[PDB]
From a paper:
PTase is the key enzyme of the mannose 6-phosphate (M6P) targeting system that is responsible for tagging lysosomal hydrolases with the M6P moiety for their delivery to the lysosome. PTase is an α2β2γ2 heterohexamer encoded by two genes, GNPTAB and GNPTG. The α and β subunits are transcribed and translated from the GNPTAB gene as a precursor molecule that is cleaved by site-1 protease (S1P) at Lys-928 to generate the individual subunits, a critical step for the activation of the molecule.
To determine if this region is necessary, we resolved the cryo-EM structure of hPTase in the presence of the nucleotide donor sugar UDP-GlcNAc at an average resolution of 2.9 Å. The overall architecture shows no major change in the presence, or absence of UDP-GlcNAc, and resembles that of S1S3 and the engineered zPTase. The GlcNAc moiety H-bonds with Glu-389 via the neighboring O3 and O4 hydroxyls. Also visible in our structure are the hydrogen bonds between the ribose O2′ and O3′ hydroxyl groups of the UDP-GlcNAc and Thr-80 and Asn-406, respectively. Strikingly, the binding of UDP-GlcNAc extends the ordered structure of the N-termini of CR2 an additional seven residues, from Phe-323 to Glu-316. This converts the deep and large pocket to a flat and shallow one. Thus, the UDP-GlcNAc bound form of the enzyme locks hPTase in an active state, and the phosphoryl transfer can occur once an acceptor glycan chain is inserted into the pocket.
Residue numbers in the entry:
A (entry chain B): 49 to 105, 316 to 435, 930 to 1061, 1076 to 1185
B (entry chain A): 49 to 106, 316 to 435, 930 to 1061, 1076 to 1203
Write the structure that this text describes.
């Protein structure tokens, strides 16, 4: 209300910090949904025949394209635990769920036609290739949550669970470093670019993605992401969606700005460094404990720069202006050496305590046990990956168990369902 | 206006979640400040003379407990620079008024011990814990407020995210396991008696965010010893520490188990009757994994028996499992109590001491200079310079000068709460000002 709006300027500064107190909104959810239809196996079988026909002179296991009713219950989980989401985007080959309520303005189907920039990759059948273009959806919010169609919210989620203005995005990591091969390939690329370091793969969970950061990452590696889009099957040489994005967010650096250093040392907004400001600059430049020798050396460097181009204790010291510091080679050299490289983005490394990731390894008793483990300990993010044979007789029993578990957690039909 | 208001209703639910997204507002700052005036020194000598005659029948008074090292001025400057979101500032001054304070500013207010203590029988307080025991009683104070110690200040840049988050509650900054140490041990024994034995760590010397409701509940839970620490006229060995008690009440307040809530969180159908899937969820919650068929069968047998005493299930004789049937079923409720461990009433988030700068100013120039340089090299969110100066050594003046120079390097620009250097408050006490008005 008007009283609520004026309350933001009711502080000592007489200014509104609503953009700094209210979390980044609006936020959208993007899904990648694939189904094995009558016209999808036919196009799938065209590619598989030409894969092994040339190289001599497993990825495609039907668990990559099978519906276990996971999208419907993921949408129900969003409606139940994340009611703050604005719009839902479902990215498909043109397949539309038989139960999806297209008349609902909040949910839209986005075909690969509108997503891929170069349409010579339309028969995709590859999650990394589709995900590399997931940030190009028209009308997408700058902050959006990418859902993997197996992941869903289990307990309750708020934008604070992904992003904080103070510490930036939350990065949930797991065990260190086709999926493993792609992880190692991206790890080598990041070692070449940002330097050698140890990395840990992000958890299987809804990922918050910034469109600007993702676009900058893809501009930094145009050829790698073009190759990722080119492939029609998950390959060892494609950029993993979450690993590359999060370890670019955590590794991107910003060039040091001497003007910013001067402004943050010159605390009185005068443009000239006083004795105290020179002292704090010397402290930030040299290595503690500070001695009179270091301060005298800094004074000598400033005096020499002045000769070769308020009141002070040293009578020979000129007024230390921003120009005198920026145009001084040794002082700027010391600034560049002492100041460690700063990250362009803020991030907060988290743990996997609130993430329930489980693989459905076609065993009815074990599947029931792990679903019961989810039931007893409700976690914030739940992932149920498909490792079923889909030809075994137990496959239908496993699907029934999963459907019963889903119905137990989310029985109420969502607004995205045809009545 | 309306465009901004309609933004929060633009979601799948169609509701506004602004209260869950936009942090707790407003937030106020409370200061406790004391000056070594002649009038205060006269009352100080009365207590110490009576203090000596008490111990003869069978330091908490030293000047470092009361001396003004100009820390309040630079703390207000730090608030104006790094925490511009604060609404109002309250200073509890023992009736005094800082000479440089600009009382004409409507965002700074002097509150005296008269309006703070419950009864006026121990007004000559001279004890920080006693004054802190009534901080939450300030009229017009916001529900969540940050208590400033007049020598702690904001160092880098702070936001309400550094104190509170809706998802994870208040942030608790703990440093190391447990007169100040004696008070910590006393409160630790009290908490061991009340909430049970555990390992505890003292909160950091920093701006502490306090909720008025939580503090009032804590003081209602321990009325006798809070009144005891209230009526002490000197910092005492056995008194309730302000931050330790509040934070380990926030982290230890448990809430009694509610069977209706458990049923509602298991009955996801919102129908009032547990289905077979919901009964399996309840069995998983109660029993220890793996959930054998024997355990579920036993649960079903217990439900059937207790139904006999007073949507098609697998058991044809199993009645509809209603909420009333579960609440009136003694064995399943006992097993729920034995399985569901006690949940905390308040949500909190334990933090580290990485962004906290706490140092002891132990009247050595070569060491104070090094410590302040360490602050200069590595800015931190919260900086505390705790007074430990000898105050009779010749180096006290030089140490004060070094501290003032460090403060001026950090915050040179005068704040909005200061009078111009050519002006000064006419009266240094509230009662004199009231006499001047009337
Ligand atoms: C939560 C998480 O970290 N998920 C990652 C995981 O997925 P995972 O290994 O679980 O890959 P899935 O088989 O679940 O496929 C991932 C997603 O791609 C979709 N899909 C798949 C094939 C297809 O032709 N069309 C289509 O849209 C699925 O519907 C699903 O939404 O490893 C993949 C390969 O590194 C990544 O791409 C995924 O982001
Ligand atoms: C940041 C922090 O955790 N500080 C705690 C620390 O303070 P510490 O041991 O540093 O206590 P100080 O000497 O700084 O005094 C604390 C506060 O009380 C004020 N004061 C003191 C004496 C007096 O007669 N009037 C008056 O108003 C001071 O101005 C200051 O605001 O240990 C005390 C022991 O109980 C606690 O109470 C303080 O909360
Ligand atoms: C996913 O693909 C399957 C397989 O094509 C679809 O199931 C078909 O649905 C149509 C329309 O109702 C029926 O006429 C066919 O008999 C079904 N085929 C099979 C093999 O079951 C299904 O509708 C697609 N969509 C979803 C959301 O699962
Ligand atoms: C699209 O990709 C194909 C891959 O063969 C390439 O030949 C073509 O040039 C690309 N199109 C554009 C417009 O870059
Ligand atoms: C299925 O899991 C159970 C334990 O739940 C195990 O004993 C059994 O051997 C598994 N069956 C197969 C075929 O691997
Ligand atoms: C503290 O009290 C002394 C005692 O005379 C007085 O001179 C001084 O102005 C007071 N200080 C402040 C900061 O108000
Ligand atoms: C002041 O405090 C208590 C209540 O907190 C009151 O009953 C008591 O009489 C007063 N103290 C003394 C010493 O009379
Ligand atoms: C349990 O929670 C419900 C929520 O509606 C509340 O009405 C009820 O009083 C609670 N039961 C108790 C406190 O015994
Ligand atoms: C102050 O510390 C220095 C070393 O930092 C030491 O040499 C000196 O003796 C100390 N002075 C006192 C009075 O303790
Ligand atoms: Ca200056
Ligand atoms: Ca039910
Ligand atoms: Mg799948
Ligand atoms: Mg998956
Ligand atoms: Mg003090
Ligand atoms: Mg102190």
């Amino acid at each position: 209300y008007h009283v609520l709006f004026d309350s933001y300027r009711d502080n000592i500064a007489g200014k509104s910090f609503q953009n700094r107190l209210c979390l980044p909104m609006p936020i959208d959810v993007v899904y990648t949904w694939v189904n094995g239809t009558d016209l999808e196996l036919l196009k799938e079988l065209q590619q598989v025949r030409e894969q092994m026909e040339e190289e001599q002179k497993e990825d495609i296991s039907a668990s990559r394209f099978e519906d276990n009713e996971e999208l419907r219950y993921s949408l129900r989980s969003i409606e139940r635990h994340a009611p703050w989401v604005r719009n839902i985007f479902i990215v498909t080959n043109g397949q539309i769920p038989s139960w999806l309520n297209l008349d609902n303005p909040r949910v839209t189907i986005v075909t690969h036609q509108d997503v891929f920039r170069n349409l010579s990759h339309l028969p995709t059948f590859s999650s990394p290739a589709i995900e590399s273009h997931i940030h190009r959806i028209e009308g997408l919010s700058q902050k959006f949550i990418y859902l993997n169609d197996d992941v869903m919210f289990g307990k309750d989620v708020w934008p604070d669970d992904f992003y904080s203005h103070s510490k930036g995005q939350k990065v949930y990591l797991t065990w260190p470093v086709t999926f493993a091969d792609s992880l190692r390939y991206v790890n080598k690329i990041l070692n070449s670019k940002f330097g050698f370091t140890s990395r840990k793969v992000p958890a299987h969970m809804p990922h918050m993605i910034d469109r600007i950061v993702m676009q900058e990452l893809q501009d930094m590696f145009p050829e790698e992401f073009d190759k990722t889009s080119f492939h029609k099957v998950r390959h060892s040489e494609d950029m993993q969606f979450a690993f590359s994005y999060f370890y670019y967010l955590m590794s991107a650096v910003q060039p040091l700005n001497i003007s910013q250093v001067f402004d943050e040392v010159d605390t009185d907004q005068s443009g000239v460094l006083s004795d105290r400001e020179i002292r704090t600059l010397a402290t930030r430049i040299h290595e503690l404990p500070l001695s009179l020798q270091d301060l005298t050396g800094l004074e000598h460097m400033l005096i020499n720069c002045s000769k070769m181009l308020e009141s002070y204790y040293d009578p020979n010291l000129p007024p230390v202006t921003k120009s005198l510091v920026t145009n001084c080679k040794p002082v700027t050299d010391k600034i560049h050496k002492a100041y460690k490289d700063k990250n362009k983005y803020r991030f907060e490394i988290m743990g996997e305590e609130e993430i329930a990731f489980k693989m459905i390894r076609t065993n009815v008793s074990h599947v029931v046990g792990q679903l019961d483990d989810i039931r007893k300990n409700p976690r914030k993010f739940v992932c149920l990956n498909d490792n079923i044979d889909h030809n075994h007789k137990d496959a239908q029993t496993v699907k029934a168990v999963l459907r019963d578990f889903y119905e137990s957690m989310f029985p109420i039909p969502s607004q995205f369902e045809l009545p």
